[PDB]
Coordinates of C-alpha atoms and ligand atoms in Angstrom, one line a residue:
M1 CA 124.6 98.5 69.8
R2 CA 121.2 96.7 69.4
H3 CA 118.7 94.9 71.5
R4 CA 119.4 91.2 70.5
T5 CA 116.7 88.7 69.5
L6 CA 117.1 84.9 69.8
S7 CA 117.4 84.8 65.9
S8 CA 119.8 87.6 65.6
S9 CA 122.6 86.5 67.8
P10 CA 121.6 82.7 69.3
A11 CA 125.4 82.5 70.2
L12 CA 125.0 85.2 72.7
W13 CA 121.9 83.4 74.5
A14 CA 121.9 81.0 77.3
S15 CA 118.5 78.8 78.6
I16 CA 117.2 77.8 81.6
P17 CA 115.0 74.8 81.8
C18 CA 111.7 76.4 82.6
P19 CA 107.9 75.6 81.4
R20 CA 105.3 77.9 80.7
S21 CA 103.5 76.6 83.8
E22 CA 106.2 77.9 85.8
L23 CA 106.7 81.1 84.3
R24 CA 104.8 83.4 81.8
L25 CA 107.2 86.3 81.2
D26 CA 104.2 88.4 79.7
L27 CA 101.9 88.0 82.6
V28 CA 104.9 88.8 85.3
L29 CA 107.4 91.4 83.9
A30 CA 105.0 94.4 83.3
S31 CA 102.2 93.2 85.8
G32 CA 102.9 96.1 88.4
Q33 CA 105.8 94.1 90.2
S34 CA 108.9 95.6 88.6
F35 CA 108.5 98.7 86.4
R36 CA 111.9 98.4 84.4
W37 CA 110.9 95.7 81.7
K38 CA 109.8 96.4 78.4
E39 CA 109.1 94.3 75.3
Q40 CA 111.4 96.3 73.1
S41 CA 110.7 93.6 70.2
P42 CA 107.8 91.0 70.0
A43 CA 108.3 88.3 72.9
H44 CA 111.7 90.0 73.7
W45 CA 111.9 91.5 77.4
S46 CA 114.5 94.0 78.0
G47 CA 115.3 95.7 81.5
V48 CA 117.8 96.0 84.2
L49 CA 118.8 93.8 86.9
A50 CA 121.3 95.0 89.3
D51 CA 123.7 97.4 86.9
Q52 CA 123.3 94.8 84.0
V53 CA 120.8 94.9 81.3
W54 CA 119.0 91.6 80.1
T55 CA 116.9 90.4 77.2
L56 CA 114.9 87.5 78.0
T57 CA 112.4 85.3 75.7
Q58 CA 111.1 82.0 76.3
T59 CA 109.7 78.7 74.2
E60 CA 107.1 76.4 75.9
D61 CA 110.0 74.6 77.9
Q62 CA 113.0 76.8 78.1
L63 CA 113.6 80.4 79.3
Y64 CA 116.4 81.9 77.0
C65 CA 118.3 85.2 78.2
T66 CA 121.2 87.4 77.0
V67 CA 123.2 89.8 79.1
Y68 CA 124.7 93.1 78.0
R69 CA 127.5 94.3 80.3
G70 CA 128.2 97.8 79.1
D71 CA 132.1 98.8 79.7
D72 CA 133.5 97.6 76.4
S73 CA 133.2 94.1 77.8
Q74 CA 133.7 91.6 74.8
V75 CA 130.2 90.4 74.2
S76 CA 129.8 87.0 75.5
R77 CA 126.9 84.5 76.8
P78 CA 125.8 84.8 80.4
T79 CA 128.2 83.2 83.0
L80 CA 126.9 80.7 85.6
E81 CA 126.8 83.2 88.4
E82 CA 124.5 85.5 86.0
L83 CA 122.4 82.7 85.2
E84 CA 122.1 81.7 88.9
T85 CA 121.1 85.6 89.7
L86 CA 118.3 85.3 87.4
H87 CA 117.6 81.9 88.7
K88 CA 116.9 83.5 92.0
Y89 CA 115.3 86.6 90.5
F90 CA 112.4 84.6 89.4
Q91 CA 112.6 82.4 92.5
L92 CA 112.5 79.4 90.4
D93 CA 113.4 76.9 93.1
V94 CA 109.7 77.4 94.0
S95 CA 107.1 75.3 92.4
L96 CA 104.4 77.2 91.2
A97 CA 102.4 74.5 89.8
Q98 CA 102.1 72.7 93.4
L99 CA 101.0 75.9 94.7
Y100 CA 98.6 76.6 92.1
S101 CA 97.2 73.1 92.9
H102 CA 97.4 73.8 96.8
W103 CA 95.4 77.3 96.3
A104 CA 93.0 75.6 93.7
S105 CA 92.4 73.0 96.4
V106 CA 90.7 75.5 98.5
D107 CA 89.4 78.0 96.1
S108 CA 87.3 77.4 93.0
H109 CA 87.4 80.8 92.0
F110 CA 91.2 80.9 91.9
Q111 CA 90.8 77.3 90.0
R112 CA 88.8 78.9 87.0
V113 CA 91.4 81.8 86.9
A114 CA 94.2 79.8 87.1
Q115 CA 93.3 77.8 84.0
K116 CA 93.9 80.7 81.7
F117 CA 96.7 82.7 83.7
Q118 CA 99.3 80.1 84.4
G119 CA 103.0 81.1 85.1
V120 CA 102.3 84.1 87.3
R121 CA 105.1 84.2 89.7
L122 CA 106.6 86.6 92.4
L123 CA 109.8 88.3 91.4
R124 CA 112.5 88.6 94.1
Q125 CA 113.5 92.2 93.7
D126 CA 116.1 94.5 95.3
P127 CA 114.7 96.4 98.4
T128 CA 115.9 99.8 97.5
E129 CA 114.3 99.7 94.0
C130 CA 111.0 98.1 95.3
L131 CA 110.6 100.7 97.8
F132 CA 111.2 103.8 95.9
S133 CA 109.1 102.3 93.1
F134 CA 106.0 101.7 95.1
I135 CA 106.4 105.0 96.9
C136 CA 105.8 106.5 93.5
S137 CA 102.7 104.0 93.1
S138 CA 100.3 106.1 95.3
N139 CA 97.5 107.0 93.3
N140 CA 99.0 106.0 90.2
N141 CA 98.7 103.4 87.4
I142 CA 101.6 101.1 86.1
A143 CA 102.3 103.2 82.8
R144 CA 102.7 106.3 85.0
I145 CA 104.9 104.5 87.6
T146 CA 107.1 103.1 84.9
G147 CA 107.7 106.7 83.6
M148 CA 108.5 108.3 86.9
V149 CA 110.9 105.3 87.6
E150 CA 112.7 105.6 84.2
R151 CA 113.2 109.2 84.5
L152 CA 114.1 108.8 88.2
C153 CA 116.6 106.5 87.1
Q154 CA 117.9 108.3 84.1
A155 CA 118.4 111.7 86.3
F156 CA 119.8 110.0 89.3
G157 CA 121.3 106.5 88.7
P158 CA 124.5 105.2 86.8
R159 CA 124.3 105.1 82.9
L160 CA 124.7 101.2 82.2
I161 CA 124.3 101.0 78.2
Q162 CA 122.4 102.4 74.9
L163 CA 120.5 99.9 72.9
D164 CA 118.7 101.3 70.0
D165 CA 117.2 104.8 71.1
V166 CA 116.7 103.4 75.0
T167 CA 119.3 104.5 77.4
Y168 CA 119.4 102.3 80.6
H169 CA 120.5 103.4 84.2
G170 CA 121.1 101.5 87.2
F171 CA 118.8 102.3 90.1
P172 CA 120.2 105.1 92.3
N173 CA 121.6 104.5 95.8
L174 CA 120.4 106.2 98.6
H175 CA 122.6 109.0 99.1
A176 CA 121.8 110.3 95.5
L177 CA 118.0 110.7 96.2
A178 CA 118.7 112.3 99.9
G179 CA 120.5 115.3 98.5
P180 CA 119.2 118.8 98.9
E181 CA 118.0 119.6 95.5
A182 CA 116.5 116.1 95.0
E183 CA 113.1 116.7 95.7
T184 CA 112.9 119.8 93.6
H185 CA 114.6 117.8 90.6
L186 CA 112.0 114.9 91.2
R187 CA 109.0 117.4 90.9
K188 CA 110.6 118.5 87.9
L189 CA 110.5 114.9 86.6
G190 CA 106.9 114.8 87.1
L191 CA 106.7 112.7 90.7
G192 CA 104.4 115.3 92.4
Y193 CA 103.9 115.0 96.1
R194 CA 105.7 111.7 96.0
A195 CA 109.1 113.6 95.3
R196 CA 109.1 114.6 98.9
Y197 CA 108.5 111.1 100.3
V198 CA 111.4 110.0 97.9
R199 CA 113.8 112.3 99.4
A200 CA 112.5 111.9 102.9
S201 CA 112.6 108.3 102.9
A202 CA 116.0 108.1 101.3
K203 CA 117.2 110.7 104.2
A204 CA 115.3 108.4 107.0
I205 CA 117.0 105.3 106.0
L206 CA 120.6 106.9 105.6
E207 CA 120.3 108.9 108.9
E208 CA 117.8 106.9 111.3
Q209 CA 118.6 103.2 110.1
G210 CA 122.0 103.4 109.1
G211 CA 121.7 103.0 105.3
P212 CA 120.5 99.9 103.0
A213 CA 121.9 97.3 105.3
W214 CA 118.7 97.8 106.9
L215 CA 116.7 96.8 104.3
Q216 CA 118.8 93.5 104.2
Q217 CA 118.0 92.8 108.1
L218 CA 114.5 93.7 107.3
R219 CA 114.5 90.6 104.7
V220 CA 115.5 88.3 107.6
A221 CA 113.2 89.7 110.3
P222 CA 109.9 88.3 110.7
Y223 CA 107.1 89.9 108.3
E224 CA 105.2 91.7 111.2
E225 CA 108.4 93.3 112.3
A226 CA 109.5 94.3 108.7
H227 CA 106.0 95.7 107.9
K228 CA 105.9 97.9 110.8
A229 CA 109.5 99.0 110.3
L230 CA 108.6 100.2 106.7
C231 CA 105.6 102.1 108.0
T232 CA 107.7 104.3 109.8
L233 CA 109.1 105.5 106.6
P234 CA 107.4 109.0 104.8
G235 CA 105.1 108.0 102.2
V236 CA 105.0 104.4 103.4
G237 CA 101.8 102.7 104.9
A238 CA 100.4 99.3 105.0
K239 CA 99.5 98.8 101.4
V240 CA 103.0 99.9 100.0
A241 CA 104.7 98.2 103.0
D242 CA 103.1 95.1 102.3
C243 CA 104.1 95.5 98.4
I244 CA 107.7 95.8 99.5
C245 CA 107.4 92.7 102.1
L246 CA 106.0 90.3 99.5
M247 CA 108.0 91.6 96.4
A248 CA 111.6 92.1 97.9
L249 CA 111.8 90.9 101.6
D250 CA 110.8 87.5 101.2
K251 CA 107.2 87.5 102.9
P252 CA 105.1 85.5 100.8
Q253 CA 102.2 85.6 103.0
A254 CA 102.0 89.4 102.8
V255 CA 98.9 90.4 101.0
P256 CA 98.8 94.4 100.2
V257 CA 95.2 95.3 100.4
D258 CA 93.8 98.3 98.3
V259 CA 90.4 99.1 96.6
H260 CA 91.0 96.3 93.8
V261 CA 91.6 93.5 96.6
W262 CA 88.4 94.7 98.2
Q263 CA 86.6 94.5 95.1
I264 CA 88.0 91.1 94.3
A265 CA 87.0 89.8 98.0
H266 CA 83.6 91.4 97.8
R267 CA 82.6 90.4 94.2
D268 CA 84.6 87.1 93.8
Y269 CA 84.5 85.9 97.3
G270 CA 81.6 87.4 99.1
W271 CA 83.6 88.9 101.6
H272 CA 82.3 91.4 104.2
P273 CA 84.1 92.9 107.4
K274 CA 82.9 90.4 110.1
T275 CA 84.8 91.7 113.3
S276 CA 84.8 95.5 112.1
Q277 CA 81.9 97.5 111.6
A278 CA 83.1 99.5 108.5
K279 CA 80.9 98.8 105.5
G280 CA 84.0 99.8 103.3
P281 CA 88.0 100.2 103.6
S282 CA 89.6 101.1 107.0
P283 CA 92.8 100.2 108.6
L284 CA 91.4 97.7 110.6
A285 CA 89.0 96.2 107.9
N286 CA 91.9 96.2 105.6
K287 CA 94.0 94.1 108.0
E288 CA 91.0 91.8 108.6
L289 CA 90.7 91.2 105.0
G290 CA 94.7 90.4 104.5
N291 CA 94.1 87.9 107.4
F292 CA 91.1 86.4 105.7
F293 CA 93.1 85.8 102.6
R294 CA 96.0 84.3 104.6
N295 CA 93.7 81.9 106.3
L296 CA 92.4 80.8 102.9
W297 CA 95.6 80.3 100.8
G298 CA 98.3 79.8 103.5
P299 CA 101.9 81.0 104.0
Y300 CA 102.1 81.7 100.0
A301 CA 99.0 83.9 100.0
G302 CA 100.7 87.2 98.5
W303 CA 101.6 84.9 95.4
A304 CA 98.3 83.7 95.1
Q305 CA 96.5 87.4 94.9
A306 CA 99.3 88.1 92.7
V307 CA 97.8 85.8 90.1
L308 CA 94.3 87.6 90.4
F309 CA 95.8 90.6 89.7
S310 CA 97.5 89.9 86.5
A311 CA 94.7 88.2 85.4
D312 CA 92.5 91.4 86.1
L313 CA 94.9 93.5 84.2
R314 CA 94.4 91.4 81.0
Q315 CA 90.7 92.7 80.3
Ligands
LIG401 N1 96.1 95.0 94.3 C1 97.1 95.6 93.4 C2 98.4 96.2 94.2 C3 99.3 96.4 93.2 C4 100.4 95.5 92.6 C5 100.6 94.2 93.0 C6 101.2 93.7 91.9 C7 101.5 92.1 92.5 C8 101.4 91.5 93.5 N2 100.6 92.5 94.5 C9 100.4 93.7 94.2 N3 100.9 96.5 91.7 C10 100.7 97.5 91.8 C11 101.1 98.5 91.1 C12 100.2 99.8 91.0 C13 99.3 99.9 91.5 O1 98.6 101.2 91.8 C14 98.9 98.9 92.6 C15 99.4 97.6 92.5
LIG402 NI1 77.8 92.4 99.6

């Protein structure tokens, strides 16, 4: 079986009304939110959503998708429920154009960036996948995380399907990452020190918190409670926790503060720590800077900063 194109097999694709100002696949799918999408052919993005593989492409006004179900399921267009899953994945109920104008109303820097970089929105990811992805993110770039995640999924998760030479796996369950040889194997897969955090966090969630239902509870808890709970996990501090809050636990106000956000705040906003005394990063000054951004942009500050990240990844 081959990766589909809109030309190859137009009968297997469905469409979701979606303007380019609401979503640009190319500024979202490989801009360091999910690490599981790859443009296997030009303008066609393939990756795994929940134990199914999808290919996505778009026109100026339409999002086209096709689904591969794997197990000798006779090929067919996406069902309604599968299309709802995708609609919810891209959080398309939320108007990005209205958010853009609201941020721009208070921020002339954002206003200039947003001209060129429209359609940057936040995926709504599976908490398990997002958590271990961002554990892998420490001192790491998107390309290297992407490989670590692909090798992790091939080694520990269920095979779904092969298309061309790419074999697609589901993200593993916690119990699979918690096992006695897991760290050893994960070091063999190139994760380094991060192998220890992966295994230890899997074991902590399972044994201390009662399994992945805990992550669903964090999704309904308040931002501040979810963040703090995540920071109890091995390898998860304020930055990683804010990533997971923003991207998987429905906390749009979470602003992950790292060196890159510091540089943006200083360079582009002229920000310096007020209350804090540190000239540079510190847990307190990092907290202060996240508060600065929420004060500026509002309850969707995490989405705003995502535009600036995506913008910066493009030269
Ligand atoms: N300030 C950037 C933090 C960050 C994001 C991110 C993407 C979109 C929204 N918010 C944060 N993705 C990453 C991937 C690797 C990495 O080393 C850092 C990041
Ligand atoms: Ni200065």
